[PDB]
Amino acid sequence: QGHMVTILILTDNVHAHALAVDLQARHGDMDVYQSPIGQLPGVPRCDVAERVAEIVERYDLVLSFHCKQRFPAALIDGVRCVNVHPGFNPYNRGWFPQVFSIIDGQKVGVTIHEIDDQLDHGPIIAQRECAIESWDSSGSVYARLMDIERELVLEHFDAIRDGSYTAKSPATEGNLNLKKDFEQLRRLDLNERGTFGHFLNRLRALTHDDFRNAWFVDASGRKVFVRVVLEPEK
Amino acid sequence: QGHMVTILILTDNVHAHALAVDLQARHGDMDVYQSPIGQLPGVPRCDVAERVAEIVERYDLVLSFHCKQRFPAALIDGVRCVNVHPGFNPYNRGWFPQVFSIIDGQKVGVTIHEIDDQLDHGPIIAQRECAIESWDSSGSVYARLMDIERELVLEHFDAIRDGSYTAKSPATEGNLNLKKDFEQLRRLDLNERGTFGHFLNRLRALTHDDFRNAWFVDASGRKVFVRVVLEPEKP
Ligand SMILES: Cc1cn([C@H]2C[C@H](O)[C@@H](COP(=O)(O)OP(=O)(O)O[C@H]3O[C@H](C)[C@@H](N)[C@H](O)[C@H]3O)O2)c(=O)[nH]c1=O
Ligand SMILES: Nc1nc(=O)c2c([nH]1)NC[C@@H](CNc1ccc(C(=O)N[C@@H](CCC(=O)O)C(=O)O)cc1)N2C=O
Ligand SMILES: Cc1cn([C@H]2C[C@H](O)[C@@H](COP(=O)(O)OP(=O)(O)O)O2)c(=O)[nH]c1=O
Ligand SMILES: O=S(=O)(O)CCCN1CCN(CCO)CC1
Ligand SMILES: O=S(=O)(O)CCCN1CCN(CCO)CC1
Ligand SMILES: [Cl-]
Numbered sequence: 134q135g136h137m138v139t140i141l142i143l144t145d146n147v148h149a150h151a152l153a154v155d156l157q158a159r160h161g162d163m164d165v166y167q168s169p170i171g172q173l174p175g176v177p178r179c180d181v182a183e184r185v186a187e188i189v190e191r192y193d194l195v196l197s198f199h200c201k202q203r204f205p206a207a208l209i210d211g212v213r214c215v216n217v218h219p220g221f222n223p224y225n226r227g228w229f230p231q232v233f234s235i236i237d238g239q240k241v242g243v244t245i246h247e248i249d250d251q252l253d254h255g256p257i258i259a260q261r262e263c264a265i266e267s268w269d270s271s272g273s274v275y276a277r278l279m280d281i282e283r284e285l286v287l288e289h290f291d292a293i294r295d296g297s298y299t300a301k302s303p304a305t306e307g308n309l310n311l312k313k314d315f316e317q318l319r320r321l322d323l324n325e326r327g328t329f330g331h332f333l334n335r336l337r338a339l340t341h342d343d344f345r346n347a348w349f350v351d352a353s354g355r356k357v358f359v360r361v362v363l364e365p366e367k
Numbered sequence: 368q369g370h371m372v373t374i375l376i377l378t379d380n381v382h383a384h385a386l387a388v389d390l391q392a393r394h395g396d397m398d399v400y401q402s403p404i405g406q407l408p409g410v411p412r413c414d415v416a417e418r419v420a421e422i423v424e425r426y427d428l429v430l431s432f433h434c435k436q437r438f439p440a441a442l443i444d445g446v447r448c449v450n451v452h453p454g455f456n457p458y459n460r461g462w463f464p465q466v467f468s469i470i471d472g473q474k475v476g477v478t479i480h481e482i483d484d485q486l487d488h489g490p491i492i493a494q495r496e497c498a499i500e501s502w503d504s505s506g507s508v509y510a511r512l513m514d515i516e517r518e519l520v521l522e523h524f525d526a527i528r529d530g531s532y533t534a535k536s537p538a539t540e541g542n543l544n545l546k547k548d549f550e551q552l553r554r555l556d557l558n559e560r561g562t563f564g565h566f567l568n569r570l571r572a573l574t575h576d577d578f579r580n581a582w583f584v585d586a587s588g589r590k591v592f593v594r595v596v597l598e599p600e601k602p
């Protein structure tokens with residue numbers, strides 16, 4: 134690779150974009166793009182499936198953040214690809230890890246890994262845990278994860294740039310959540326039974342700033358959105 | 368007796384006190400005090416238990432506009448006393464009625480009644496139901512209760528003043544909740560089992576603006592306060 138690694142950053146996430154802009158300031162020989170479905174205003178857009186040859190020619194590393202789908206096989210063939218996933222691989226791989234970890238008690242955190250042909254699966258370069266508190270919501274754990282992502286990436290950047298790491302596969306496969314798994318959690322069945330703790334975990338997992346995630350339908354057919362506000366005694 | 372009725376209002380609640388002040392424009396011979404329990408800024412105090420004899424001598428009618436001090440027998444027995452109560456008697460008498468009605472499905476509303484030795488008991492002069500929607504909390508219901516209280520009082524004030532009504536006791540005793548019943552409800556047991564509906568009713572019942580009412584203790588012993596935000600979908 135040597136001393137001049139040309140880097141393509143791909144992300145649709147607002148925090149990771151901001152981090153990428155800081156990396157570009159440090160690195161220089163870097164372009165930062167979003168996908169055809171990103172919502173970052175003014176950020177150049179790249180359809181990776183259609184631009185493979187061009188990417189393989191121009192860049193020495195592709196560094197994605199919070200990637201949701203597989204890369205083209207040819208891209209993997211042609212160029213080193215690394216992803217930054219805001220989960221603790223291999224637990225709750227896939228969509229919105231802290232939502233699922235609030236519910237199931239698995240670790241959450243940030244994982245830098247090589248990209249293979251399974252989602253959030255390839256060999257791990259670096260990772261960092263984020264402890265979840267009994268008062269946390271999705272929103273509050275996520276803000277900490279974004280801080281962790283920044284710290285972790287900045288710590289390991291030169292090694293990622295230089296390829297001077299040796300990544301290691303996780304010992305187990307873990308589990309994967311899909312977009313549809315999140316959507317399925319949103320509907321609250323008023324007749325569902327459980328413990329109060331189970332229900333509070335559900336609510337706090339679906340609480341993320343003012344997103345209208347959780348809803349129920351009342352006996353008259355009216356939909357009602359729900360979120361919780363949790364505050365530890367101090 | 369119209370203007371010849373000399374009225375005392377005892378009130379410990381900001382909304383009820385504002386209503387009392389408004390009534391003072393409609394009726395000259397009316398005094399407004401808070402009890403020793405009140406924390407209303409600038410409002411003069413009257414200790415009802417110490418001042419019973421003078422109250423009975425000087426007034427023709429005593430109104431409790433959410434007075435927190437219990438009226439002793441000598442007061443209630445010696446002058447007509449009327450309560451304006453933010454519950455629908457005889458259901459969930461006593462403390463914070465809408466909290467308990469959100470959970471149990473009993474009616475809530477406002478009741479104006481003559482006072483006797485029991486709490487929120489006695490002949491009903493007027494009352495009005497407040498509906499509770501699936502998205503309501505204690506705070507949202509209570510705000511409507513204060514609007515209902517103002518409506519009902521303004522409607523019935525002349526009859527109340529003059530004692531011209533024919534009041535009727537409720538046919539059943541209903542049920543009574545005290546401050547301790549609310550303190551106990553506050554604490555959420557994480558191992559309690561129930562329906563999601565039942566749980567949401569508990570949380571919204573304990574949700575009232577930014578009051579830190581509901582709490583649980585986590586596995587490590589840390590207390591955590593909880594409230595819910597419910598928003599119905601707009602058409
Ligand atoms: C102090 C306190 C209040 N609240 C809410 C629920 C309450 O219904 C509402 C108003 O509270 P408050 O203390 O102004 O209570 P009031 O509305 O003045 O009524 C209380 O006193 C009257 C003398 C009695 N007739 C009532 O039955 C009793 O509920 O605020 C809370 O949710 N938590 C609280 O700690
Ligand atoms: N005779 C009488 N009947 C009433 O219905 C009545 C009065 N007086 N006076 C004004 C007001 C008093 N209302 C109440 C309502 C609830 C409690 C109550 O829960 N008491 C608790 C102790 C409360 C504390 O520790 O702060 C108890 O355990 O008795 C007390 C007074 N009131 C109607 O509105
Ligand atoms: C899109 C979306 C996100 N979120 C929360 C959970 C996500 O972890 C967080 C960040 O969302 P987003 O930036 O879409 O996801 P990512 O971290 O995968 O780039 O926002 C919701 O709660 N509801 C939603 O509908
Ligand atoms: O209520 S909706 O889910 O339909 C719209 C969500 C709007 N907000 C999402 C969260 N951002 C803040 C970042 O989480 C503000 C806009
Ligand atoms: O958090 S505490 O419950 O100790 C105190 C909260 C005080 N707030 C009560 C609600 N009012 C608004 C009126 O309902 C504002 C202050
Ligand atoms: Cl949040």
Ligand SMILES: [Cl-]
Pocket residue numbers: 326327328560561
């Ligand atoms: Cl169960």
Ligand SMILES: [Cl-]
Pocket residue numbers: 504505506507574575576
């Ligand atoms: Cl409220």
Ligand SMILES: [K+]
Pocket residue numbers: 206209210
């Ligand atoms: K290949």
Ligand SMILES: [Li+]
Pocket residue numbers: 450451452453461487
């Ligand atoms: Li009362």
Ligand code: NA
Pocket residue numbers: 188189190191192193211212
């Ligand atoms: Na290349």
Ligand code: NA
Pocket residue numbers: 371372373427
């Ligand atoms: Na008189």
Ligand code: NA
Pocket residue numbers: 411
């Ligand atoms: Na005086």
Ligand code: NA
Pocket residue numbers: 422423424425426427428445446
């Ligand atoms: Na008298």
